[PDB]
């Protein structure tokens, strides 16, 4: 296990969440794909901290704050899902296109 | 021998000013018939 | 009539190909925020080939 | 060393007093909690003037700078929330939502934006960009039952949480392209080779930097949010969250990438020639008033990027003077959008017609702020555009200023369309307010802050170009601390 | 050309769009023919 | 001489128009607002004469009201004003016409608080064009009359106002940008970053660089002064306007594009002027032949003389691009003559429309039987635009013909064809002006007189505005050295700066 | 599917060709104290702003998801008619 195999794993996890960002039709699967992106930048970061400058781990501190923001981006994000669902009684990303042009 | 513009412009300026203030008071047709009304060229 | 139609037609065409330009890029946005995320991710792929050479 | 963050920590304290008063007093505190946040923002503005004389120290272990550039953008975001609170004192008080709960999320976006302007670590850039972005999704869907604000809070979420992950993957790469070194001055000392890894780290961070400033391949959230959001939030994200993305781009692209500089000055020209075109030609085909000012903020963003791509001492001075007078043009126009949306419903164009005899203070405010947005003399936005094209002509860039001038005449036509349907339409051509205007009072709750935020803004829009010489010296001192 | 053809001495009868283009190439050619005359015949 | 004179004259009607929303007594229409704008327009014109008869100090080349205040040292723009011989007649002409344009704006009762604001904003903003010796203040003052003349057409105008107002504001703001493009190109040439018109004229530019700046200025100044390709904005905005708005349009605003041709295309750009002077006299003749035929082919009354304003402009281009001390003296004279002739003609069109309400000229015929003093003044004002001697419309065109075919710049096969073709407008101007007089006033065949045109009169104030406009028309026609002595020494330096360029 | 395989083809070209300056020092000397020494020396101002971010995320996500059971039919005032908990710009077709 080298540094290179971690970043390819993080880059592959980035493009799986990228594919889930554009192809998902349920609004909650889009938020679940956002957590795939924010764990891609954490898997990229601890691998950057384990192999580069591991004495003073500055990536693992920075990997903590991404976990905290994505915890607050999902709590804010799911309150947005529950706000649309009370008015528009579906969760369907092909049905929210009323602010088109 | 050239007729200079400054003494005849300075002499015609107070004649020009007090006639604009006088001829505004004396006017017709813009207060009695006035079918143009508000819109001055509609 | 060469004034009102020919050299006035060029002036009323600069204001016509700009009004129908803004009514063509008005359709660039269509809702469906997945498509908005597509243009964000495509322009990332554009600028990494455009700027490496 | 915590004396440099005093303009932000005064706003931290009054963020909590207007929160606890909502819990203690329970909607009886809404009569005073806006005015406590005004002097909390005013007390945070007035403590930047003793910080102006300080010789630009770097506090908090090298993770925060207190230079003149960081203090200029801190005052722009603090004035953005000061103008927003004078608007939303009646706006969200009329929707029935809590007033103290609104101005808490509005002040977290302020202190989150104000900490962007002086941040130097990769983590404090991202943390302060998060609490500006996380707070703004809650503000565009604050009304919570509209199916338009809920649709605008969703599109801003799934792009905002997406583009902050593209921003993180470029920020995490900057931690890895150097041997550690989360600080931006320590980044530039380690990487100068201009490799392909530095290019992808550059593209990934201006997918989120140019997402707050709304350039065209990343602008798609802006016209849909700005018509669904509450109009004070629309007024805030156009001068507060937009200058914070410009506060980032000077602090980031000049400190982290001084080696790679002809690449992001080549990308941001493409971001400028696209947002000057698509900001100003698509605003012709707009009927909603908040949607015409939505493409305006995309179009006025390309004027700010004219001074950003030239990279001169007058170029960065041209974008800071334009962003300063931009606050006096948006917050005066958006005041009249709110003041027309409160008297009558349905604030859109071809409903302002037949005015100037019923609301003459609204039409004098809305015309002089939209005419200045077109850049006509002798208003503030004329002189702001003059200094962008003077600094644009100074170092090359002859096609940017020609496109900046040709799209400024297309800018004139849709701004004068609103002045057409305010003052030139006869009183037999009004659709709304056809003897239906509520005969303005300035005695109800929050209308007197709404009026003084209009009078002191058009005065700052009509006279900020004639009296620009103090502002030209206040801006040019904030450029010597820019590499 | 309906408002140009009032009940006075106008409306000669050559207001067709086939005549508009053939009047353009003679009028705009005479200005351009005098401009190209001007840069060579003057000096 | 220590008092700020031209700074006051520019800034007086702007600061005094702010007191118009604070004028009391709105008893019906605005009567005290109407008298307030005449009171400030009169005392500002008196400041122009007081600065002239005491401090102009003529037969002196250079500016004699030169006041260079500092505005923005970071950009390099200064508030530098001054009146030389190319400016001081047009500064005196602007203060004279706009004072009568307030007096012509007496029947306006639509929005009187808004009317006299924008007309005084044009009164401060039109003097500011000829007076400033700068670029970024010149482009400021050029676009200072962009909004208040838009709203003067869009509110108080005919029909198709909104087409005429938005075509105009897109055609002139879309062409004033080339004053910013060429004004910034000249100031950044070399090493000195000065923006004043003095240092920018004395700077030496390359010949290939000046051909771009000359082409940029000709797009910018071929719009306001209507050179016949870029002229389609005019007869819409000049066809749909009231009488007092039109006296500022054709009287003053057309001359700002002719003032800047002598100032910014001959003084500052002499080597590009000589390379592209024969295209101007070609465009100047075809300004006359196109517009005088189109005046004859049109039957709309306000649109007929609107095209006639383009034809009298055509003698200026022959006067500028002739390199003669008498030819250029006829170009500045044509700007002052047509400004007095047009503002007298276009005042009477709004006077004739106020009684007949048609402008179509087919239903008219026999108007001169009903009203007599209007027809007596419509004849004498149209006679001045016939280039009739004894009036200033002739000696303005006489100096152009003599000034062209005596110049040692063009060859003999070129000078005969231009003088022969520019004299076709001597035949063509009595074709439509006398046919307009005949098909409105001459004749027994009147209108219906029951539905339309039920009233007919002639106010004594409308006689005074015509009679005081014919004093500088006839008085220059009987002594053309009355105006030539203002610019005899300045035109002698404008031409001699181009006399050093002509062997090329 | 084009852009997702395109970003992966971009980054695998980027990850492989970039020379990473990995350090041959011994890592993690009890890495729970060096992450708490970092929360109060270097990463201190991110640490205090995370509390204001979490407090805002508890304010806003409650007011965006709580049930409107206090006063749902609540016409408080009016200059023109505005529904409760909705923006005053009412939707209309031009």
Swiss-Prot record, chain D:
Membrane-traversing stretches: 4-24, 32-52, 69-89, 99-118, 122-141, 157-177, 196-216, 230-250, 264-284, 292-312, 320-340, 364-384, 386-406, 452-472
GO terms under biological process: ATP synthesis coupled electron transport; photosynthesis, light reaction
Catalysed reactions, semicolon-separated: a plastoquinone + NADH + (n+1) H(+)(in) = a plastoquinol + NAD(+) + n H(+)(out); a plastoquinone + NADPH + (n+1) H(+)(in) = a plastoquinol + NADP(+) + n H(+)(out)
Location(s) in or outside the cell: Cellular thylakoid membrane
Recorded GO MF terms: NADH dehydrogenase (ubiquinone) activity; quinone binding
Membrane topology value: Multi-pass membrane protein
Source taxon at top rank: Bacteria
Keyword Translocase among UniProt keywords: yes
Keywords: Membrane, NAD, NADP, Plastoquinone, Quinone, Thylakoid, Translocase, Transmembrane, Transmembrane helix, Transport
Entry's EC annotation: 7.1.1.-
Major place of residence: membrane
Self-association state and partner proteins as the record states: NDH-1 can be composed of about 15 different subunits; different subcomplexes with different compositions have been identified which probably have different functions.
Family listed: Belongs to the complex I subunit 2 family.
Role: NDH-1 shuttles electrons from an unknown electron donor, via FMN and iron-sulfur (Fe-S) centers, to quinones in the respiratory and/or the photosynthetic chain. The immediate electron acceptor for the enzyme in this species is believed to be plastoquinone. Couples the redox reaction to proton translocation, and thus conserves the redox energy in a proton gradient. Cyanobacterial NDH-1 also plays a role in inorganic carbon-concentration.
Protein name: NAD(P)H-quinone oxidoreductase subunit 2
Species this chain originates from: Thermosynechococcus vestitus (strain NIES-2133 / IAM M-273 / BP-1)
Phylogenetic lineage: Bacteria, Bacillati, Cyanobacteriota, Cyanophyceae, Acaryochloridales
Gene from which this protein is expressed: ndhB
Curated annotation (Swiss-Prot), chain F:
Enzyme class: translocase
Membrane topology type: Multi-pass membrane protein
Keywords: Membrane, NAD, NADP, Plastoquinone, Quinone, Thylakoid, Translocase, Transmembrane, Transmembrane helix
One GO term describing the cellular component: plasma membrane-derived thylakoid membrane
Protein origin, superkingdom: Bacteria
Bilayer-spanning residue ranges: 3-23, 35-55, 90-110, 114-134, 136-156, 168-188, 208-228, 242-262, 276-296, 313-333, 334-354, 386-406, 416-436
GO biological process: ATP synthesis coupled electron transport; electron transport coupled proton transport
Similarity field: Belongs to the complex I subunit 4 family.
Function noted in UniProt: NDH-1 shuttles electrons from NAD(P)H, via FMN and iron-sulfur (Fe-S) centers, to quinones in the respiratory chain. The immediate electron acceptor for the enzyme in this species is believed to be plastoquinone. Couples the redox reaction to proton translocation (for every two electrons transferred, four hydrogen ions are translocated across the cytoplasmic membrane), and thus conserves the redox energy in a proton gradient.
Name of this chain's protein: NAD(P)H-quinone oxidoreductase chain 4 1
Record gene name: ndhD1
